[PDB]
Amino acid sequence: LQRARTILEFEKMLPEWLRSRFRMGELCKVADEDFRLCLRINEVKWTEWKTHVSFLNEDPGPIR
Amino acid sequence: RLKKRIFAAVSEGCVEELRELLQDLQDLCRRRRGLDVPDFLMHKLTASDTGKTCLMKALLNINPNTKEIVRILLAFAEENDILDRFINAEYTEEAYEGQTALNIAIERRQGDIT
């Protein structure tokens, strides 16, 4: 929590065109005409076994 | 134009709609110069970019009626005798090289289709 207060004060002082360069996230076509600028996190689960329905992409690689 | 209609019909689960499209393929197979019609029919059921066949497109998208769609597609390749080439196709890209149809059916936990 004490390091998190340091990060948000360094962010308020750097100028506006630096904030566009150091921006997190990526545009994703979530649904029909819906783009949301999302953040990606990977996981590994060895207990919950189920067939996979409701993915976004069929090809499971890191495309490009 | 026909190739994209089959990939949509198989992914969604369109059982009745699938049958006249394969019949329309049979309509275009009676009429040709007739030189390489076994190699021609593989060209209409395989995406040329990667090598994904319509059987591979079926198993990635599990439907409540995906058991019968596989049963139709195995009957069709038997009648035209490209059954070994159709059931043993592979991807050609670097990221997926060598993946087959039953390699997908095991990961989707489908015991009975396998």
mmCIF file of all heavy atoms in Angstrom, chain B residues 35-56:
data_model
loop_
_atom_site.group_PDB
_atom_site.id
_atom_site.type_symbol
_atom_site.label_atom_id
_atom_site.label_comp_id
_atom_site.label_asym_id
_atom_site.label_seq_id
_atom_site.Cartn_x
_atom_site.Cartn_y
_atom_site.Cartn_z
ATOM 1 N N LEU B 35 -11.256 -34.799 -63.993
ATOM 2 C CA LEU B 35 -9.884 -35.298 -64.001
ATOM 3 C C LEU B 35 -9.401 -35.639 -62.598
ATOM 4 O O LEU B 35 -8.837 -36.716 -62.373
ATOM 5 C CB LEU B 35 -8.949 -34.279 -64.652
ATOM 6 C CG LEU B 35 -8.780 -34.285 -66.178
ATOM 7 C CD1 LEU B 35 -8.446 -35.681 -66.684
ATOM 8 C CD2 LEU B 35 -9.988 -33.732 -66.917
ATOM 9 N N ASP B 36 -9.604 -34.733 -61.641
ATOM 10 C CA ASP B 36 -9.066 -34.886 -60.294
ATOM 11 C C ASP B 36 -10.150 -34.591 -59.251
ATOM 12 O O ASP B 36 -9.965 -33.817 -58.317
ATOM 13 C CB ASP B 36 -7.826 -34.010 -60.109
ATOM 14 C CG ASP B 36 -8.069 -32.549 -60.458
ATOM 15 O OD1 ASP B 36 -9.170 -32.212 -60.939
ATOM 16 O OD2 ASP B 36 -7.148 -31.731 -60.249
ATOM 17 N N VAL B 37 -11.312 -35.224 -59.432
ATOM 18 C CA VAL B 37 -12.431 -35.012 -58.503
ATOM 19 C C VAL B 37 -12.200 -35.528 -57.081
ATOM 20 O O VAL B 37 -12.858 -35.013 -56.163
ATOM 21 C CB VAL B 37 -13.740 -35.501 -59.137
ATOM 22 C CG1 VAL B 37 -13.909 -37.017 -59.117
ATOM 23 C CG2 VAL B 37 -14.978 -34.775 -58.576
ATOM 24 N N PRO B 38 -11.308 -36.508 -56.785
ATOM 25 C CA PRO B 38 -10.982 -36.688 -55.354
ATOM 26 C C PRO B 38 -10.152 -35.556 -54.773
ATOM 27 O O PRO B 38 -10.342 -35.192 -53.607
ATOM 28 C CB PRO B 38 -10.223 -38.021 -55.318
ATOM 29 C CG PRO B 38 -10.655 -38.729 -56.493
ATOM 30 C CD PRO B 38 -10.779 -37.675 -57.532
ATOM 31 N N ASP B 39 -9.233 -34.985 -55.555
ATOM 32 C CA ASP B 39 -8.460 -33.849 -55.066
ATOM 33 C C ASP B 39 -9.284 -32.570 -55.092
ATOM 34 O O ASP B 39 -8.980 -31.612 -54.374
ATOM 35 C CB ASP B 39 -7.191 -33.675 -55.894
ATOM 36 C CG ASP B 39 -6.211 -34.805 -55.697
ATOM 37 O OD1 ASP B 39 -6.248 -35.442 -54.623
ATOM 38 O OD2 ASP B 39 -5.393 -35.049 -56.607
ATOM 39 N N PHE B 40 -10.325 -32.530 -55.922
ATOM 40 C CA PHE B 40 -11.163 -31.340 -55.989
ATOM 41 C C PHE B 40 -12.062 -31.223 -54.768
ATOM 42 O O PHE B 40 -12.332 -30.114 -54.292
ATOM 43 C CB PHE B 40 -12.004 -31.362 -57.262
ATOM 44 C CG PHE B 40 -12.894 -30.171 -57.409
ATOM 45 C CD1 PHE B 40 -12.365 -28.942 -57.762
ATOM 46 C CD2 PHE B 40 -14.259 -30.277 -57.190
ATOM 47 C CE1 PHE B 40 -13.176 -27.840 -57.895
ATOM 48 C CE2 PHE B 40 -15.075 -29.180 -57.318
ATOM 49 C CZ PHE B 40 -14.534 -27.959 -57.675
ATOM 50 N N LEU B 41 -12.549 -32.353 -54.257
ATOM 51 C CA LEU B 41 -13.498 -32.304 -53.152
ATOM 52 C C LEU B 41 -12.791 -32.009 -51.835
ATOM 53 O O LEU B 41 -13.402 -31.474 -50.903
ATOM 54 C CB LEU B 41 -14.291 -33.613 -53.091
ATOM 55 C CG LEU B 41 -15.541 -33.710 -52.211
ATOM 56 C CD1 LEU B 41 -16.558 -34.603 -52.879
ATOM 57 C CD2 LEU B 41 -15.228 -34.264 -50.827
ATOM 58 N N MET B 42 -11.503 -32.338 -51.738
ATOM 59 C CA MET B 42 -10.731 -31.932 -50.570
ATOM 60 C C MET B 42 -10.448 -30.438 -50.597
ATOM 61 O O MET B 42 -10.236 -29.814 -49.553
ATOM 62 C CB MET B 42 -9.427 -32.723 -50.491
ATOM 63 C CG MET B 42 -9.607 -34.189 -50.158
ATOM 64 S SD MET B 42 -10.404 -34.432 -48.564
ATOM 65 C CE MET B 42 -9.137 -33.815 -47.467
ATOM 66 N N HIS B 43 -10.446 -29.844 -51.788
ATOM 67 C CA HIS B 43 -10.186 -28.416 -51.899
ATOM 68 C C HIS B 43 -11.374 -27.592 -51.418
ATOM 69 O O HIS B 43 -11.211 -26.431 -51.026
ATOM 70 C CB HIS B 43 -9.835 -28.076 -53.346
ATOM 71 C CG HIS B 43 -9.453 -26.647 -53.561
ATOM 72 N ND1 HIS B 43 -8.241 -26.134 -53.154
ATOM 73 C CD2 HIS B 43 -10.122 -25.623 -54.139
ATOM 74 C CE1 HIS B 43 -8.179 -24.854 -53.473
ATOM 75 N NE2 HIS B 43 -9.308 -24.519 -54.072
ATOM 76 N N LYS B 44 -12.572 -28.176 -51.423
ATOM 77 C CA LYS B 44 -13.756 -27.437 -51.002
ATOM 78 C C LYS B 44 -14.057 -27.634 -49.523
ATOM 79 O O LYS B 44 -14.880 -26.906 -48.961
ATOM 80 C CB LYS B 44 -14.962 -27.842 -51.850
ATOM 81 C CG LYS B 44 -14.825 -27.482 -53.318
ATOM 82 C CD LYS B 44 -14.790 -25.976 -53.483
ATOM 83 C CE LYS B 44 -14.669 -25.564 -54.932
ATOM 84 N NZ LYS B 44 -14.555 -24.085 -55.053
ATOM 85 N N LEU B 45 -13.422 -28.608 -48.878
ATOM 86 C CA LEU B 45 -13.663 -28.869 -47.465
ATOM 87 C C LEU B 45 -12.454 -28.589 -46.582
ATOM 88 O O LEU B 45 -12.436 -29.025 -45.427
ATOM 89 C CB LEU B 45 -14.125 -30.312 -47.263
ATOM 90 C CG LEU B 45 -15.510 -30.610 -47.834
ATOM 91 C CD1 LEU B 45 -15.863 -32.078 -47.685
ATOM 92 C CD2 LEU B 45 -16.545 -29.734 -47.156
ATOM 93 N N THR B 46 -11.452 -27.876 -47.088
ATOM 94 C CA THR B 46 -10.244 -27.570 -46.335
ATOM 95 C C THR B 46 -9.865 -26.121 -46.575
ATOM 96 O O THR B 46 -9.694 -25.708 -47.726
ATOM 97 C CB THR B 46 -9.084 -28.483 -46.747
ATOM 98 O OG1 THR B 46 -9.408 -29.844 -46.441
ATOM 99 C CG2 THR B 46 -7.801 -28.094 -46.036
ATOM 100 N N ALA B 47 -9.739 -25.355 -45.494
ATOM 101 C CA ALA B 47 -9.245 -23.991 -45.581
ATOM 102 C C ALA B 47 -7.796 -24.004 -46.044
ATOM 103 O O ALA B 47 -6.953 -24.684 -45.456
ATOM 104 C CB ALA B 47 -9.368 -23.288 -44.232
ATOM 105 N N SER B 48 -7.512 -23.252 -47.108
ATOM 106 C CA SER B 48 -6.200 -23.324 -47.742
ATOM 107 C C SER B 48 -5.147 -22.578 -46.935
ATOM 108 O O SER B 48 -3.944 -22.755 -47.163
ATOM 109 C CB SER B 48 -6.274 -22.762 -49.161
ATOM 110 O OG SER B 48 -7.146 -23.529 -49.971
ATOM 111 N N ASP B 49 -5.576 -21.729 -46.001
ATOM 112 C CA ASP B 49 -4.627 -20.920 -45.244
ATOM 113 C C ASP B 49 -3.874 -21.773 -44.229
ATOM 114 O O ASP B 49 -2.642 -21.725 -44.153
ATOM 115 C CB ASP B 49 -5.366 -19.773 -44.552
ATOM 116 C CG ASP B 49 -4.434 -18.675 -44.064
ATOM 117 O OD1 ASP B 49 -3.209 -18.764 -44.288
ATOM 118 O OD2 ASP B 49 -4.931 -17.713 -43.446
ATOM 119 N N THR B 50 -4.603 -22.566 -43.442
ATOM 120 C CA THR B 50 -4.008 -23.359 -42.378
ATOM 121 C C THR B 50 -4.127 -24.860 -42.584
ATOM 122 O O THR B 50 -3.225 -25.595 -42.175
ATOM 123 C CB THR B 50 -4.656 -23.012 -41.033
ATOM 124 O OG1 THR B 50 -6.043 -23.357 -41.075
ATOM 125 C CG2 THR B 50 -4.521 -21.531 -40.745
ATOM 126 N N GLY B 51 -5.198 -25.329 -43.212
ATOM 127 C CA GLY B 51 -5.449 -26.746 -43.327
ATOM 128 C C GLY B 51 -6.582 -27.254 -42.472
ATOM 129 O O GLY B 51 -6.786 -28.471 -42.403
ATOM 130 N N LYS B 52 -7.327 -26.364 -41.827
ATOM 131 C CA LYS B 52 -8.437 -26.768 -40.978
ATOM 132 C C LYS B 52 -9.594 -27.286 -41.820
ATOM 133 O O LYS B 52 -10.160 -26.550 -42.632
ATOM 134 C CB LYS B 52 -8.897 -25.585 -40.138
ATOM 135 C CG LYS B 52 -9.949 -25.916 -39.120
ATOM 136 C CD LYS B 52 -10.438 -24.654 -38.456
ATOM 137 C CE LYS B 52 -9.378 -24.058 -37.556
ATOM 138 N NZ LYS B 52 -9.900 -22.867 -36.842
ATOM 139 N N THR B 53 -9.954 -28.547 -41.620
ATOM 140 C CA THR B 53 -11.078 -29.149 -42.317
ATOM 141 C C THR B 53 -12.360 -28.880 -41.546
ATOM 142 O O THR B 53 -12.342 -28.394 -40.415
ATOM 143 C CB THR B 53 -10.880 -30.656 -42.487
ATOM 144 O OG1 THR B 53 -10.908 -31.284 -41.204
ATOM 145 C CG2 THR B 53 -9.548 -30.933 -43.136
ATOM 146 N N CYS B 54 -13.487 -29.220 -42.171
ATOM 147 C CA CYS B 54 -14.777 -28.959 -41.543
ATOM 148 C C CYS B 54 -15.066 -29.956 -40.430
ATOM 149 O O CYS B 54 -15.929 -29.714 -39.581
ATOM 150 C CB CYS B 54 -15.889 -28.979 -42.590
ATOM 151 S SG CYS B 54 -16.111 -30.559 -43.413
ATOM 152 N N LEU B 55 -14.362 -31.088 -40.418
ATOM 153 C CA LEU B 55 -14.454 -31.982 -39.272
ATOM 154 C C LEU B 55 -13.744 -31.385 -38.065
ATOM 155 O O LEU B 55 -14.198 -31.540 -36.925
ATOM 156 C CB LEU B 55 -13.878 -33.352 -39.625
ATOM 157 C CG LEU B 55 -13.916 -34.412 -38.526
ATOM 158 C CD1 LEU B 55 -15.334 -34.673 -38.084
ATOM 159 C CD2 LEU B 55 -13.270 -35.689 -39.008
ATOM 160 N N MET B 56 -12.633 -30.685 -38.301
ATOM 161 C CA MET B 56 -11.949 -29.989 -37.219
ATOM 162 C C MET B 56 -12.766 -28.806 -36.729
ATOM 163 O O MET B 56 -12.696 -28.440 -35.553
ATOM 164 C CB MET B 56 -10.576 -29.519 -37.684
ATOM 165 C CG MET B 56 -9.602 -30.624 -37.982
ATOM 166 S SD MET B 56 -8.046 -29.939 -38.555
ATOM 167 C CE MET B 56 -7.165 -31.441 -38.924
#
